[PDB]
Every structure is written in structure tokens, then in C-alpha cells.
């Protein structure tokens, strides 16, 4: 039985708890695992029956602390300096097998319980803008696609245009999606004739007002 999750902002802290729903896992080694949204299970931390050995995923080492009590009723995971990357559904588990290392998630058994923990980014950040270089050479025929990857910004929205408004047909600016880093990312792409590439300039005009980040980037072959 669990508790202590929820919503907190980047730089917050939470202390999840794991209460024994049968009285004693006091003699069994215990672990915390997490499953991020759209992700698989990953190891977080573990602790030997005595509380002596304590083990931590690389991603959370330094920030998270696993601890327990002596009666084997309570195992804890103190989660400090929370990042958006820590957004996941967490659960404790009893290590009931020894098929490998104490890092091996497959050794741990749980029963479908989880606590949702969400870490909401806060800072105003402008995007980096990378080119999506044309998909074929300027000597090939048919249609070419190119674009701009507008990555790692917060909050919504950004404005994207091509040649400060000169190119609009064939343009698709994708909806921003919140990355696992709590920052948005989107691509803007355009299809053009292959033959045309070398004779015209394609520049995305990204403007992120919340930060007066305003970038224009030439997209050309590699």
C-alpha cells in the first residue's frame, strides 16, 4: 500500500511510502521501481533486509534516498531536487528472486499498485533550432522535404514561419509535444520541388515571445 506522490514543480521534493499490506517484509530485500509515461519499467533503488546496502539508479543517485524501518512495515523513497525526468508512476516491490544483480527489475515482484508523481517545469526558456536537411539531392527529381526542429522551449507557444511569411504552401507545423524533460518540441516541415533546392533559400523564423528568443535558421544539404 502506497502514498506520497502527486504534482510538484521542478526543484520540489516528495517522500513516497510503502506500507506492508500483510505485516512483514522485514526479512526481504526491497526496491522501488518506476514507469514513466509512454515508457517501460526502470530500476530506481533497493535496500537489503538490514538497511545496510543501498543501491540507486544512475539517473537518481545523489538525489533519492531509500530507507526502511526495523519492524518491516515501512519502506521509503525520499526524492529530492526533482526533475521533470522523474515524472513517472512509482512502486515498491519485494525482491523474490535472485536471477542476477540487485539492479535487475525482473527479480522484483509487485502487485499492480502505483503512485503517480508528476514534476512540472517552470522556467521561461527559448528553443534551440536545428535544420532538417533536405531528403534528396538537388539533382534527383520529384519532391523534397526539409524543415526545422524547434526543440527545448517552455512555455507554449512558439510562432514558426518560412522566409518571414513568403513560403506557406506545403508547410506543416506540428503541434508542440511536451518532452520527458518538461520542455516542448516541434518540427515545422515543408515540401518543395527537388529541382528548386539550390536556387532558393529556406529559413524558418521561429519566435518565442515569452523569452524574446527569435531565431532564423538556414536549412541546407549536409
Amino acid at each position: 500500500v502506497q502514498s506520497g506522490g502527486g504534482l510538484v514543480q521542478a526543484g520540489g521534493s516528495l517522500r513516497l511510502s510503502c506500507a506492508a499490506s500483510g505485516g512483514t517484509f522485514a526479512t526481504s530485500p526491497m526496491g522501488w521501481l518506476r514507469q514513466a509515461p509512454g515508457k517501460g519499467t526502470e530500476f530506481v533503488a533497493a535496500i537489503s533486509p538490514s538497511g545496510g546496502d543501498r543501491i540507486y539508479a544512475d539517473s537518481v543517485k545523489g538525489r533519492f534516498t531509500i530507507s526502511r524501518d526495523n519492524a518491516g512495515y515501512f519502506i521509503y523513497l525520499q526524492m529530492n531536487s526533482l526533475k521533470p525526468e522523474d515524472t513517472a508512476v512509482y512502486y515498491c516491490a519485494v525482491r523474490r528472486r535472485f536471477d542476477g544483480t540487485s539492479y535487475y527489475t525482473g527479480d522484483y515482484d509487485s502487485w499492480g499498485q502505483g503512485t503517480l508523481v508528476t514534476v512540472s517545469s517552470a522556467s521561461t526558456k527559448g528553443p534551440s533550432v536545428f535544420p532538417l536537411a533536405p531528403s534528396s539531392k538537388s539533382t534527383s527529381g520529384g519532391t523534397a522535404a526539409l524543415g526545422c526542429l524547434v526543440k527545448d522551449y517552455f512555455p507554449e507557444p512558439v510562432t514558426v514561419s518560412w522566409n518571414s511569411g513568403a513560403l506557406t504552401s506545403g508547410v506543416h507545423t506540428f503541434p508542440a509535444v511536451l518532452q520527458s524533460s518538461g520542455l516542448y518540441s516541434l518540427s515545422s516541415v515543408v515540401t518543395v520541388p527537388s529541382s528548386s533546392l539550390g536556387t532558393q533559400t529556406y529559413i524558418c523564423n521561429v519566435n518565442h515571445k515569452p523569452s524574446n528568443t527569435k531565431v532564423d535558421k538556414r536549412v541546407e544539404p549536409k
Binding site: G38, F130, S135, F174, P175
Partner: protein, 213 residues
């Protein structure tokens, strides 16, 4: 509380056709205190109907509501271009007021296969320690597709994000981006980067790929 469910989840219809949208309640909605809303991206829902069958002021005749008890219907007797949107039912008979999960009304057009392109990460970006590879599915219909990343024939999972445009206002197609993100370390530990696309318009899945260079 009263749980409302809408069916179907998506209606695909041609301009001018009639749309029939259903709202089912988990228990009786007293006095027919049921409302319908239209919702378009970036806009607050727009009240169409209240008391199950009364139009709000200025709402066109082609929106009509009926039903009682646990079953309600919104009819759009003729789909105008501006009517393709998401539609929600709401009950205000018992607190809390509850909402359905929406029925999307989209434009049906002929099946169109996607044009697929793959983009490696730029030199610039790798220098930041991260690599994004983008797969573009351009101008397809219907909306459903499958996009798998394979790195050295290894099916990838958990490290890709998808995004889909709204239905194009000119040709009624959709476009889709899948972006596989990994560190520079994990990037140049590998050779073949492939995007595999399955879609109804294609006779067999199309794969576009590059070898990191």
C-alpha cells in the same frame, strides 16, 4: 456522479452529410438538463444546445438535439465546412456537472498513402550531446498508421514521440512526425537508422533509412 459516454469516438463524413452523435448517461438525467458543445482547437467550447433540444442564441437550425433519460442525440443535419470539430455532451442535473469524452467529426476523403521522409540529426545538434532523428509521414488519410523505429533491425520502444497535424483545410489529409531521441553516445554506437510505416494506402510497409555518416 453521472458518467457520460459518447459514441462513436470519430465520425468520418463528407461535407453536406448528416451527422448523428450519441450521448449515454450512467443514470437518468433529470428534467433533460443536457447540453451540447462544439469545440475547436484553441477555443473554448461553444454552447449549441441546452435542455437537450433548445438551441442557444444564434446557433444555426442544422444543429438539433433530442433524447431523454440516459440516451441523447445531437443531429447536425448538414455538415458545413465549419462544423468539422469535436462535440461534447454535458449534464447539469446533479453536481458535479460532468462532461462526455467527445466525438470528433472529421472530413472523409479518399484513402491517400503517406510520403515518408527521414531526417538525420544535424551536426549542430550532436555537439549538444543529443541526437533527434525525425520521420515524416506527409499528407495521408485516414489518420491511423503505425510507425516503428529500427536501429540495426532492433525494434525501439519508449524513446520516440509522435505528433499529428489537424486535418488539412485544403486537402483533408493528415501529417505525422515521429521523433526518436537518444544521446550522442547511444547514437554513434549504431549504424542503421530506419523508419517503418504501415498504412492502408500502401500495398506493403514502406521503410526509409540512412546509415549514420
Amino acid at each position: 456522479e453521472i458518467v457520460l459516454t459518447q459514441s462513436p469516438g470519430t465520425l468520418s463524413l463528407s461535407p453536406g452529410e448528416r451527422a448523428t452523435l450519441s450521448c449515454r448517461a450512467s443514470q437518468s438525467v433529470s428534467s433533460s438538463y443536457l447540453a451540447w458543445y462544439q469545440q475547436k482547437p484553441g477555443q473554448a467550447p461553444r454552447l449549441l444546445i441546452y435542455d437537450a433540444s433548445s438551441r442557444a442564441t444564434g446557433i444555426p437550425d442544422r444543429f438539433s438535439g433530442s433524447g431523454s433519460g440516459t440516451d441523447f442525440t445531437l443531429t447536425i443535419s448538414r455538415l458545413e465546412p465549419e462544423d468539422f470539430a469535436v462535440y461534447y455532451c454535458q449534464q447539469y442535473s446533479y453536481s458535479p456537472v460532468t462532461f462526455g469524452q467527445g466525438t470528433k467529426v472529421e472530413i472523409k476523403r479518399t484513402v491517400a498513402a503517406p510520403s515518408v521522409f527521414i531526417f538525420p540529426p544535424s551536426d549542430e545538434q550532436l555537439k549538444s550531446g543529443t541526437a533527434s532523428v525525425v520521420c515524416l509521414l506527409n499528407n495521408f488519410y485516414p489518420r491511423e498508421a503505425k510507425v516503428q523505429w529500427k536501429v540495426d533491425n532492433a525494434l525501439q520502444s519508449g524513446n520516440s514521440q509522435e505528433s499529428v497535424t489537424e486535418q488539412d483545410s485544403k486537402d483533408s489529409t493528415y501529417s505525422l512526425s515521429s521523433t526518436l531521441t537518444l544521446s550522442k553516445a547511444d547514437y554513434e554506437k549504431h549504424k542503421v537508422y530506419a523508419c517503418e510505416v504501415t498504412h492502408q494506402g500502401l500495398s506493403s510497409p514502406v521503410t526509409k533509412s540512412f546509415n549514420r555518416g
